[PDB]
Amino acid sequence: SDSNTITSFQVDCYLWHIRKLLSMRDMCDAPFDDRLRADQAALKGRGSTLGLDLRVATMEGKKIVEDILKSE
Amino acid sequence: SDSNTITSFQVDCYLWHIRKLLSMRDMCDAPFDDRLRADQAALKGRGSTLGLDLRVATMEGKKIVEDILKSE
RNA sequence: GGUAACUGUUACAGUUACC
RNA sequence: GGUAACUGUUACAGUUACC
């Protein structure tokens, strides 16, 4: 495995989750929803490529984002 | 102006800031950096289109994202 | 050679915001 | 009519990870 590849995937998963919360609350525009849809399919492909569960990678991405923000 | 368009831009700006932090810590892979570069140009275009300052929009996206995560 | 995601460019169709 | 960003499809060239 490549460490930064996994880290990038986990963070992309968590940032997708944040974006989805915005859409769910009716706070986003249509192109934003278009990107959500396309990125969801892309993250499924990357997760299969890396052999990583998406739910678990999202939780790991949350920890990574919180740590780099705590260090900012 | 359209409220969800502005909100979408503010949030995209703040998430770009988070991604940039990961890259400045050399924790990302090359495609992640390619996306960062492309999205920085795109956000400059959207900010010009909306007449919005990117630094301010980034701070406003931070508040929106924190408010959403707080109510999750 | 293959799988996956992406970047630059190209052609067509479209969505949104604004003028 | 235009500006901006994007989505789907297409063509070419690359980047990365893994096999």
Q: Can you walk through the features of this model?
A:
2 copies of one chain form a homodimer. Chain A has helices at 3-24, 30-50, 54-70. The first copy, chain A, is mostly helical. Chain A has one domain (1-72). The longest helix of chain A is centred in the first third of the chain and has 22 residues, at 3-24. Chain A is flat and about 35 Å long. At the A-B interface, helix 1 and helix 3 of A face helix 1 and helix 3 of B. Chain A binds a RNA duplex (19 and 19 nucleotides) through helix 1 and helix 2.
Quick overview:
Chains A, B: It comes from Influenza A virus. The first copy, chain A, is mostly helical and 72 residues long.
Structural class based on helices, strands and sheet pairing of chain A: mainly alpha
- In DSSP terms (H or I, runs of 4 or more residues), the helix count of chain A works out at 3
- Rg of chain A: 13 Å
> How many distinct folded domains of chain A?
1
Give the oligomer, counting copies of the same chain as homo and different chains as hetero.
homodimer
Order of helices and strands of chain A: HHH
General shape of chain A: flat
Portion in strands of chain A: under 5%
Largest sheet of chain A: none
Total strands of chain A: the figure is: 0
State the helical fraction of chain A.
over 70%
Q: Largest interface, by Cβ-Cβ below 8 angstroms: which chains and how many residues each?
A: A-B, 24 and 24 residues
Spatial separation of the terminal alpha carbons of chain A? 27 Å
Subcellular location (chains A, B): Host nucleus; Host cytoplasm
GO molecular function (chains A, B): protein serine/threonine kinase inhibitor activity; RNA binding
Family (chains A, B): Belongs to the influenza A viruses NS1 family.
Subunit structure (chains A, B): Homodimer. Interacts with host TRIM25 (via coiled coil); this interaction specifically inhibits TRIM25 multimerization and TRIM25-mediated RIGI CARD ubiquitination. Interacts with human EIF2AK2/PKR, CPSF4, IVNS1ABP and PABPN1.
